[PDB]
Symmetry: D2
Subunit: 502 residues, 4 copies
């Protein structure tokens, strides 16, 4: 007996036990006499069209692949539940938080950002930590990262950021000039670049990392009072990171390290958990916060905004079929039940549009009817009809226009969004020259020790050495603005690497 992952097929055979093999059918349920040989004109003759077993099978094989996610393509999934352990109903009327001990089923997908489907798990990247909560008020998708911040604060830069992180459009090679040209020109990236090149840039699998919603959200209570919050889901297995050397070894030996680690943990009963916290900021505190509290390059310091515990995430179930439950799962940040709403974080606003839009391409118009995406603890009743691969009854003969005089579904005024007044012109406001260094300096000085600062600078220099000198210069200038020792330590390592380079 090996690890449970290695024994998947042996275990499947054992569960079947005395059961006779199912009859092998075509897609249309017609039994197949022989699937090992095609119909030919005698033993050395050509293949006949009336071999429909062959064509049925081959035509399906020809269509197996769907587009990979534009980002976060390489992932691992698992199922479990969220349990409420504390009352936050003062902040949010959301049914998911309704009472202590209320259990909600969840689905999680962990991912890297830039790698395609066949890429290695144990690489330096932000990790995605997406959680789908199947509530009675519909699905809530908290599409988090393993970092509280991001590289950019305006969503129109997102495609450019991802392009710079992916392959050269001509050579199809990863390109340090592209990576560092973009970051050196957009110094709002320094905070997340500091996190990325620190030890938590390569977690030891998915169980040993935190998740964050990253954005400011808005909680609304039963009295219609709103606060702003951040969501934090801190690992109960403890933070653990791979060394650059072990990460490199594993990238070759076990490209699927994270998938295997998580599958084996859950298969052997070692159910990974995370403690779910919020930070709360009142609308008055948002007016007086030293930065933009809706700026995705900024945290809320823990002294001013302590973590309020809410509940626990537990993953206790592996997917039965990876394609059905992990490849096809879709998280939309716009899937927010009543009591949880978007802040005006510009990055969150962009994500409200982009995810349903990419889901309709990647999966199809009716992707919310794929079982893993279905809000199966809610009744879907609306005026939406048809579209390709329409499953179930398409809401039967129910009236398909609103308003109507025939008793079809009705708006629920309690589900109405929280209203705010906003001051200013409708236009494009520059946020490039918001504060790019203050919190990065707090991280470098107050959070990292001396050993950690040395590895941070070694990890950066090792990547940045491959960029052109003009890019190295602009990158080091930005690091120097954080702290002279940050910049100078990087420049010192670059001088060594650029000298070795013929």
């Amino acid at each position: 007996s090996r690890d449970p992952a290695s024994d998947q097929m042996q275990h499947w055979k054992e569960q079947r036990a005395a059961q006779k093999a199912d009859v092998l059918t075509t897609g249309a349920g017609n039994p197949v006499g022989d699937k090992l040989n095609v119909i030919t004109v005698g033993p050395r003759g050509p293949l006949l069209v009336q071999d429909v077993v062959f064509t049925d099978e081959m035509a399906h094989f020809d269509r197996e692949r769907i587009p990979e996610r534009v980002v976060h393509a390489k992932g691992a999934g698992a199922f479990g539940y969220f349990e409420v352990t504390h009352d936050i109903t003062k902040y949010s009327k959301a049914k998911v938080f309704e009472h202590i001990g209320k259990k909600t089923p969840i689905a999680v997908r962990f991912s890297t950002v830039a790698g395609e489907s066949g890429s290695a798990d144990t690489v330096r990247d932000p990790r995605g930590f997406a959680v789908k909560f199947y509530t009675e008020d519909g699905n809530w998708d908290l599409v988090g990262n393993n970092t509280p911040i991001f590289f950019i604060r305006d969503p129109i830069l997102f495609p450019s950021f991802i392009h710079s992180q992916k392959r050269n459009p001509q050579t199809h090679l990863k390109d340090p000039d592209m990576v560092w040209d973009f970051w050196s020109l957009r110094p709002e990236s320094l905070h997340q670049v500091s996190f990325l090149f620190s030890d938590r840039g390569i977690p030891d699998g998915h169980r040993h990392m935190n998740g964050y919603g990253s954005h400011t959200f808005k909680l609304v209570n039963a009295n219609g009072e709103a606060v702003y919050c951040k969501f934090h889901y801190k690992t109960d297995q403890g933070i653990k990171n791979l060394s650059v050397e072990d990460a490199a070894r594993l990238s070759q030996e076990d490209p699927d390290y994270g998938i295997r680690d998580l599958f084996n943990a859950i298969a052997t009963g070692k159910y990974p958990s995370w403690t779910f916290y919020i930070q709360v900021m009142t609308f008055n505190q948002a007016e007086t916060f030293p930065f933009n509290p809706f700026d995705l390059t900024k945290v809320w310091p823990h002294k001013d905004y302590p973590l309020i515990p809410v509940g626990k995430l537990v993953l206790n179930r592996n997917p039965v079929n990876y394609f059905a439950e992990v490849e096809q799962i879709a998280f939309d940040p716009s899937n927010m039940p009543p009591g949880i709403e978007a802040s005006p974080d510009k990055m969150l606003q962009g994500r409200l549009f982009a995810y349903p839009d990419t889901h309709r391409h990647r999966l199809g118009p009716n992707y919310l009817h794929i079982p893993v995406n279905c809000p199966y603890r809610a009744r879907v009743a609306n005026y939406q009809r048809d579209g390709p691969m329409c499953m179930q009854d398409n809401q039967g003969g129910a009236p398909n226009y609103y308003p109507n005089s025939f008793g079809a579904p009705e708006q629920q005024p309690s589900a109405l969004e929280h209203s705010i007044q906003y001051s200013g012109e409708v236009r494009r406001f520059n946020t490039a020259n918001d504060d790019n260094v203050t919190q990065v300096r707090a991280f470098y000085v107050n959070v990292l020790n001396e050993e950690q600062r040395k590895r941070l600078c070694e990890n950066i220099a090792g990547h940045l050495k491959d960029a052109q000198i003009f890019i190295q210069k602009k990158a080091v200038k930005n690091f120097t603005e954080v702290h002279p020792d940050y910049g100078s330590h990087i420049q010192a390592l670059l001088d060594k690497y650029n000298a070795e380079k013929p």
Copy 2:
């Protein structure tokens, strides 16, 4: 109270009765506070992206349409059953025929051929009469027409035939030159053109027409003995046709005449039935038949090949949702359970390829999992996985390769196809100059009376008058070869029409 079709919504409201209206949700099951107004910056300001209710709804609306069927776009559907009334188990081991009184659920779609989705029902065209039998050996699709024959005997001509019958590629107008240039150049069309322009060219709705499989199929019994057969499903409501004048009136007044007629019949308990017959021809009779018995332009005369009764088709249920059950239904002639097989009819061979192929485009790779297409009285177990809009479990963790040592599904040797030897070179054989007139003459002389011959010639002349003279000449030449009176009567009417034409 009006006809049941007109009262669809009133009846839906009545069934709901005391029930409170369902809560109006987004696709992800999140309740909607207000679906009558969008979120704006004050009462005369611009629309906000965070109006995801608006975007969810509008994005679905934007994707409602799927491609129409390349042919037979305009249709009416209904459900019911096939009941065996006689034993043909001597001819076929097919479970659908297994014992007297065995009931199998069916789905039927009636259609015209050339009209697009918004076109009129009461036009001159062949009608499609497609029957899906949900058997325990998987689905059997008998994709029949309201005529025993077709216009062509080689499938490589099918796209050309349909192009000639549809719109001019530049003007987007129906084009008599295209229609009659093609038919006049391909005189194998005379038999089906004679049927088309006779009284049965415009049935009085779907209940008053026969269906035919048209092709020769092969029945195989439990001893592995094969015969050839034709399938005939003769209306129990009796043949009834619209006059050209009534057909024209209805095309304007009731474009959906056939849909309405069928829906109202079933809603008022007038359940239309058809008697299901076979004709049988032994392999020896196939050697000695005066024509090619696999030629789709030929019938088997009833004196030599009498109708053997088998069962009854009954339609007793309307679709609950037209899009879900009629627009999305897919019939594949290649869906044949054991005991029923393709003959070497070249046209049937082409159809073995074309239908699954168009279904994967029109509906999607996984179109067999759409509920109306699902073989729900059979267990589908095979090595096919994934593809877009993968529903159910994608066969869970079952081994996905064959052969395997882990107890996944197994071929069933009893389901093996019937073997035949064929004589000749593998090449393209010309069938253009097979007999194009003998059976057409039998129809003109022995089956039509004098009144019927007059209307046949008036219906043809009225269409053919719009073609160029050179096409009229070639068309009349072919009609003359059937019978001098056929040709001369048409030429006489054309002389009258061409004289009136300035």
Copy 3:
């Protein structure tokens, strides 16, 4: 010789003249020996897979259909130019208006709203009048109707409105209960319902109708000063309408009446033109306008806001291939060059999202590279890459992220949008009970004469008679609020129809 439309193929043959027929090829340019017969095992044997001519052809045929437009499916197209005849550069810096006599190529598609692809042209409906201007500042799509107003003033009602106008979801029949339940519940529809049921509800083909942008747009001049405008394009062939009786006759005799009329006009040199006007309203006039000037159910009266002439639209070219140039053409109201911008008309704001969204489904992600949609008088240079059916070079090896240090395309600050301040909370504002009758009364009393009022009431009663009495009552109540004689005349006709009804 017949009409030019009827002679399309004869004319094509004549242009070819002495030229030998092209060699018939597969899709991959391989010459075809025989396309009239398939490869079989001898003359009565089965079809071979190695017949790739057959499969290449059939597989293409299987994929011919794309989804029809969700609305405005049935259309006619033509090409020509817009010519400036007056200076409006005081109002707009748009290059399309730059100097007198400046010619810009245009594409136009005329359509009905509710009919599917095979439906009749000569039916009561609004007509679409979409104009694409191929300018040097990219395409400008003015996606107009043959009416200055619409049935609704909030875009979240659009899918419901279109559902109510299309087929019952169960029966697939047009449903007067659905049509009149929706209109009777949404009396903002009265203005466009009055226009719809008047004589201009059935134009005599496309050449004899006006087009309107319908929405308020914003013009911005070279000094950055903004006004609001309406666009009007008045027929130079004069308004002409079909009688209900002639419209009904033509629906049967010539379903493609509008396509044929337009094709024949342009083929015979009778080039239809429209005079292009604007109405202008200053930002101060917008503050003091008695209604919401951004309300799509309201006109700007001509006395207060006279038509300022701008130029002339001329259609002088037929499409060479209908599918390539009319079926595949896509108009996005969001395609606005500098000098032309969206007003805060809520309906226009909805249309900014919906059209690119439906285009990516109906045509594909890269639909702007389809030749008729390509901005071929502008250089497209940006950071967009890849997507299915990527044509041209995908911008070669150009840097694919912004900002960059490598000289790839740069933002043009002169192309920056006009900034405005808006007052109020971000929320859903009810507009149902805005004024629904004032301008409708002006139309009934001041614009229609006595004969026209009689036909208006006869046309409404003839449709509304089929709705349930409770709907008839609510409909008549709303008509009565416009004018007692409007309501009473309709009720009188209904009493007659409801008495005849058993």
Copy 4:
């Protein structure tokens, strides 16, 4: 200055030189004022829908990914030419071979088989070596491998073979049980497994490997005389292989090793070439060949069937855009000009269907109009019309049905396929127990030396050690049947590995 691949962007900037940056446009060619910031309601307000720059860009980004190839996903491409150096016009009338020194442009894609898009180049796998020849008789796709043979001889096993080589359907991990269960049950795989686990299982990039057509094809000369042939394209750079240790290192250090190697070779003028040979076998030799000459698990020994030189393949051009020219390129083995035809190799027959079928899914119906796939040295003229993303003119107003009387394209009887008679029943013939060992033994004994046999057995044992013992036993049994020393050496290494395993 670095390697040319690293300098892609610097070189692009240099070519631009004094040229001003292009203006940044939307997809519709409208200039963009600012692409660095979105439109918001004041500086901390929500995002507006009328930010169409944002939506245009984001919507395109959302749709960038197309499905990866179902197999051979990870690839490198290049362009060049084929030059004829010898006369084989006695064997083939194909224009590509017409006269000595005739140059034909080519496109090549090199690939591994099982890896997804982000996987490492330097792994043990067969390599794809696909060549597209743009001839005047249309495209010829020679879709070859770096091995003359394959693992299976019946195409209905292909999906199972690829499934066994890819990820476990539940765990999404590579599974040695799946790999070796399949191979141990299908011992026809021994020949290609022996090649795979030998030194040529990991070439040193694409320039240092041979290509083979693998299948028997049929050459037909101007007199209509047919022979059978194999195509061989032997590297002029010489065979060179990575050691397992270097391959493992490079998999981590340079996942894109093969892409980089090839791009840098061509960028520095080191244009890789291959010598193109045929082996010829007459129809009489095919009758008397000791094996099935159409069996893809068998070679034609060089002594009996010497290599006849034909020409040279040269790659002298890199792709300008990888997505446009390498990701979107499609090779169909069915794209064969006159003079080259399919043999009855069952595997080739399956490939005649599968490639156009997967291309219509992966790329779209009109994938042959993507510039890299276009037969641009041939005139495409046929009766195929429409389909999504129809580019060019869709053949204008040409008649769209065949036959016609209007001078549209005509079949070319010289392009007719070669006719053969075949003996036997139309049925499924078992080929599992064809000879599985004779040629494998010739390889083990006569072609490998002692050092090579040792590495062969070490490479197999290192993979097979991870399979269950029952699979190891069945695998070793099959190796023993090749040669007792083959089996025993593997069993010896397994005993060592299975002892180390706790």
